Design a protein around this ligand. Sequence first.
Ligand SMILES: N=C(N)NCCN(CC[C@H](N)C(=O)O)C[C@H]1O[C@@H](n2cnc3c(N)ncnc32)[C@H](O)[C@@H]1O
Ligand SMILES: N=C(N)NCCN(CC[C@H](N)C(=O)O)C[C@H]1O[C@@H](n2cnc3c(N)ncnc32)[C@H](O)[C@@H]1O
Ligand SMILES: N=C(N)NCCN(CC[C@H](N)C(=O)O)C[C@H]1O[C@@H](n2cnc3c(N)ncnc32)[C@H](O)[C@@H]1O
Ligand SMILES: N=C(N)NCCN(CC[C@H](N)C(=O)O)C[C@H]1O[C@@H](n2cnc3c(N)ncnc32)[C@H](O)[C@@H]1O
Lengths: 361, 343, 343, 361
Amino acid sequence: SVFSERTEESSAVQYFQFYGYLSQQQNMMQDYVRTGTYQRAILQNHTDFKDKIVLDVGCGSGILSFFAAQAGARKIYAVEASTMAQHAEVLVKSNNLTDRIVVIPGKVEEVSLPEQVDIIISEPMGYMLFNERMLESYLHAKKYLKPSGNMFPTIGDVHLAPFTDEQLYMEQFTKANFWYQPSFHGVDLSALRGAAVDEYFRQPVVDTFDIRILMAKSVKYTVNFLEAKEGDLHRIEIPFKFHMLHSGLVHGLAFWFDVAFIGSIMTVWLSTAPTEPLTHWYQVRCLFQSPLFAKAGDTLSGTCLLIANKRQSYDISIVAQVDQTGSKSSNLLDLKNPFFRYTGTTPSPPPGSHYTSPSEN
Amino acid sequence: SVFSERTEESSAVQYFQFYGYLSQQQNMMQDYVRTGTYQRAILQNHTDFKDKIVLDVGCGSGILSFFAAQAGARKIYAVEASTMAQHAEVLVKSNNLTDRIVVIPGKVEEVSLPEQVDIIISEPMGYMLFNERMLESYLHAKKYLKPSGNMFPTIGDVHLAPFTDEQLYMEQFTKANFWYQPSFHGVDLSALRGAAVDEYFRQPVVDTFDIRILMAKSVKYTVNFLEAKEGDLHRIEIPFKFHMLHSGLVHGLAFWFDVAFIGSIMTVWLSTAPTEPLTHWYQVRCLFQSPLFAKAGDTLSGTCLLIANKRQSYDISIVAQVDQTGSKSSNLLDLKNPFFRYT
Amino acid sequence: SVFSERTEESSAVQYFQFYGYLSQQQNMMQDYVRTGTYQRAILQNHTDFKDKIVLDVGCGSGILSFFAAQAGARKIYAVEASTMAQHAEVLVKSNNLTDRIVVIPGKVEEVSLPEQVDIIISEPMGYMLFNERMLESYLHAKKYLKPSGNMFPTIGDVHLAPFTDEQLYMEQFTKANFWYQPSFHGVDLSALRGAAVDEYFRQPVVDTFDIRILMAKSVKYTVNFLEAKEGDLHRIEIPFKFHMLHSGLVHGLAFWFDVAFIGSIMTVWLSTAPTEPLTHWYQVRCLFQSPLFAKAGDTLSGTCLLIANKRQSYDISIVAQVDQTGSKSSNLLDLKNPFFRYT
Amino acid sequence: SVFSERTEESSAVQYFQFYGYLSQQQNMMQDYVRTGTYQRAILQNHTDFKDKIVLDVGCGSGILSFFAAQAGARKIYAVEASTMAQHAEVLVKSNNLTDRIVVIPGKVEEVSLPEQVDIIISEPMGYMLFNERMLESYLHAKKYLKPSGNMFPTIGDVHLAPFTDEQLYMEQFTKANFWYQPSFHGVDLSALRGAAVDEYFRQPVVDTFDIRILMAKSVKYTVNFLEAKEGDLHRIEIPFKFHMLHSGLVHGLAFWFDVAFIGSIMTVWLSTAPTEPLTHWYQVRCLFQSPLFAKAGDTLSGTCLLIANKRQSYDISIVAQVDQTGSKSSNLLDLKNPFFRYTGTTPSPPPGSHYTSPSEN
Ligand SMILES: N=C(N)NCCN(CC[C@H](N)C(=O)O)C[C@H]1O[C@@H](n2cnc3c(N)ncnc32)[C@H](O)[C@@H]1O
Ligand SMILES: N=C(N)NCCN(CC[C@H](N)C(=O)O)C[C@H]1O[C@@H](n2cnc3c(N)ncnc32)[C@H](O)[C@@H]1O
Ligand SMILES: N=C(N)NCCN(CC[C@H](N)C(=O)O)C[C@H]1O[C@@H](n2cnc3c(N)ncnc32)[C@H](O)[C@@H]1O
Ligand SMILES: N=C(N)NCCN(CC[C@H](N)C(=O)O)C[C@H]1O[C@@H](n2cnc3c(N)ncnc32)[C@H](O)[C@@H]1O
């Protein structure tokens, strides 16, 4: 049982309890970009599925298996570890696809499949692509994949870029300064101010933002799921060298990801970039403990190291330095506990992004 | 050891992990009604604390212990199981109260105290008062209480009342109706709609509301913390008979609670009623899957039965009937997974 | 008789009893757009009537025959099957037009006319144009029309467009949810909810609406009354492909119609579109039991099939699909029993 | 069949098609006074039902049969001629009462019951009680009733009273005067004005009203369902002598009805009077073609004659005379085609009912 040795029990119980809820399945299914892009990818590459054997890793409601069924698959093994497996089976029954879709309750690391498959489908991406560590299960499932078999998605891209957001940065101190008062109902809280500040900065911020806060073209780190092994995802080192497009203070790094379905007919992309319509993954921003001043043309170099932990997530280590000035900043973050900041309000661009008089119009 | 026998470890880990965060302590402390009412209650009854030994069950940041210290307590044993305990001690030292406040890390069910105490203080109330099952720890702590000691709070009121809110009901039904689609991207989801309705309606709705949605005077169920035993909170049966003041559709039952600090000088009340300023407890509403029609003058009778579970919460069973017509409704709710509807 | 073979007696009796009431004639006549547009269409094309022989199919009060007489017709045969025929005759005499307007009581499928006519006039449009199946009588009357004769109206437009209206959908769903009750006075009705939802949603909604609910430019189905055969109206298949202009939930299809009077002098249009002044036809909406999500740029394709039945109406089957997602909806509507929602 | 002989096929078809709709059953079920009063009547007289054989004439959804089952009935024969019968059986099955309730599709005049019953229940009342002529089916069903069986309802009271309502009277001419114009789009409509007036006055008006429009205490006509024969309802002669309490113009007669359930434990009344909460029967008003002037103390004497027709309704002949003056009025009405006037607005009392200054207040 590969899964249990690399996963804390406490985390796994709640993790699979979470996905046992129909409401969450609904939440994901109602993400039109995600579901529509998967459906487009599967059906537009029907020759990759027609009369093929398919494996759906973590079928959830079973939706992707149904998409696979629409594409003409001869047999679909749909594996699911949460109680949702029982609901998926109901849908298979009610859609008269019992002869084509077989639901297998359990973890893909632990269940037995009767035969090799021609293609594996799954939706294992979390925040920052890697969150939840389901990608390792996705890669693990290749033990059931035939040589020259395919993976849907086939590759995953994670993007990095430095950003400026004075309000976001300042917000942390505004919140933490609650503890900087000598008589909260007669109690001096100040001694805990440092600890509070520390706690807030270790939280990655989940939300969206205006693309004009980005201070350099993103750096890309690619995982090829056809080529990658599980161990590749235990330690992910993403070095970066940003060529600053704008001068200003760098408050941290922004994160998003893309995945590609590379079929025989066409390649289909699913993107969570801030330039694209919002998805349920939104974007993730990691603050530096101290902002870095960089001029346009300067280089911001460093490393983002993602270290997997047993809470089905990652410890994020970011170190960055301005090569021209030696200005250096670092932060360590706990991705398992992100701060959901999104409010629905349209993000504002950084001031002043006006290069022409706003009053002439 | 108690607690471990009544609590699945997985739940407890996440539970005490949760309260180890300063941000949650801040969120609770910044609830001015709560903190201010507690401080007022403790300080105006200083004689119940003056030169006394105090036990603070779940001291968290330690705020209540500091209130106890301000009131003149001789010694306060502050028990906390989460890592917040490490932070509380820091505050005790920086406030020069080490001679009076003693932080004891661990679960109140497991720690050893040097002596019996004159009074127990705690803030163990959750959603619908009983959520989190900390009241059991609060009552459990009486093993350290002197035969004539006191408890702050002293008693707890849970109030029930039928309400009408078409908007909320259809709001939930609209969500459940997602699973009614016969062809969601070509897939028939309808077979699971019954399961979906059940899941959504099993969620208690946490928020506030205008009192004019209430269709009858509330029924009150009281827990006396001085008299109650831990075992009493494993199964809570609350019978009710409402005499309807208005005609209309009853979409469910609304819940809020009061606690009373009965001190030697005065009694101080903390209320989460919808007539009072909002607290972080808000109010809780349990929907019927189908509303019950009642005319003014009719009686709505039934029972709310709370069964404690191993996830530090309650399985809630509500059965309600219009006596004049036999119109009957039954519902099961999972308090551990509420729907936060507020703004 | 062609009429009796396609119509159950009960329906015909009720139908012609209905139009025997003066109050309905008043109701129709007081529709100023209708009456005025007919009169304008006839009078502006007076040369199509001047010294001509005219057939008025279903003359009712006789108003259109009077318009034809005003336009200078030599002789008008006014056919009416209801007892209104006796009232029309009273008006002909009191208006001193006995020499020009001849009322012939009976069904146009059954009466004998003394001669062939130069032009046929009628107002045979019902809800969604086709309701009441009077168009078939209108076309049947063409046996009396000269080879180079004309028809007023000459053509008919049926316009379809997808719409979004959460309020209407919830309004209809709320009614059907009555049957979701597990204990109505102690009785479980739920087993019938499916039958109830189906029944309510088979009702076309007759009323008006703001044009901003339309999510794509309309699709048109045209009937040319000069070219069409009666048999053409027994089965009407209307395929559609909508290019969505707005993203959102499609709750159903909106229907309205135009007719055109193509005369020698000018063409005059009568429209029941939602952009035009309201008529007694209002507009008609067919709800989906489950709405379809579509993005701007997507295509919504499908079919509206009308099958004539013996109750002087149509069984309507609407099937619609979002081509990009495979989301599919199907519905049956009984045009015979519409829901009059207008307030 | 006794039914077909007294009913034109067209009417019967339309009639039973109407009641095949769930929405129509729902409308009646949602009339709380009606349904609640029936349930109270049956349950509070449980000794009339416990271990008894029951006949439900025109069971519709079956609700009254269910009330009978709740009261402890041994066997319920539920007869229904519309397609609602198919739905009722579904409810009997889903409520696990197949052993106690037997749905019999068909007309009560045409079906066969296996045995005699102890009590007949029905809801056969129409506008002014007699509309729809369902009372005859109710009485017809007595062929299955034991010599000491009961009927629920047991009696029906029809109440008549003279009223004054100048606006209602004027409405008819306001509507009819549409036809009194010499050039409607160039056409003289005047010749049909008389016919239009006649048509409007032949319509009974269904709605409610303030009781102060009533000018005398009501006259009552009682039908005892235990004693009455079908033939008794073909011609109903209601003599009346009203002693006027108020002076004014009598514009017509107001009609409403009560039924009583006379059980072994108690008598329960269902009333549609204007002093009682509104039901879906509202009240019915029949206008005189010419109003009659009457003084307080005068007597208004005459006759209301109801003649049954084959459209499942009645032709109403009303003749009234002020005895002190000889002033006479008559009207003929078609109960089959009433005017539904109700609008939800609270009815106003006649002016001036203020005996003290409204400004005091
Ligand atoms: N954060 C996320 N992206 N979430 C995506 C939502 N689901 C995808 C559902 C489906 N593919 C759809 O698109 O509807 C993920 C589902 O996959 C299951 N799962 C995880 N590990 C597993 C494992 N070792 N073995 C079996 N199942 C596993 C989970 O229980 C969960 O139900
Ligand atoms: N629903 C609620 N509001 N709840 C109140 C929130 N806190 C109140 C903090 C403090 N009393 C104050 O008022 O600031 C409660 C704090 O007490 C701790 N606790 C719970 N069970 C315990 C147990 N068996 N043993 C020891 N500590 C326990 C929790 O870990 C938590 O940190
Ligand atoms: N929804 C609608 N408007 N609908 C149109 C409203 N009326 C038009 C009235 C007239 N043209 C006017 O403008 O006053 C329809 C009138 O025409 C008569 N009719 C129908 N079928 C017939 C038939 N087979 N044979 C003879 N007469 C028939 C009807 O009895 C009815 O009198
Ligand atoms: N204006 C009215 N209120 N009217 C009363 C409304 N319903 C009462 C239904 C039931 N008691 C309930 O409460 O749902 C009347 C129902 O009884 C049926 N019916 C009439 N004549 C019949 C006949 N000769 N044989 C069999 N059924 C008959 C009708 O088809 C209709 O379904």
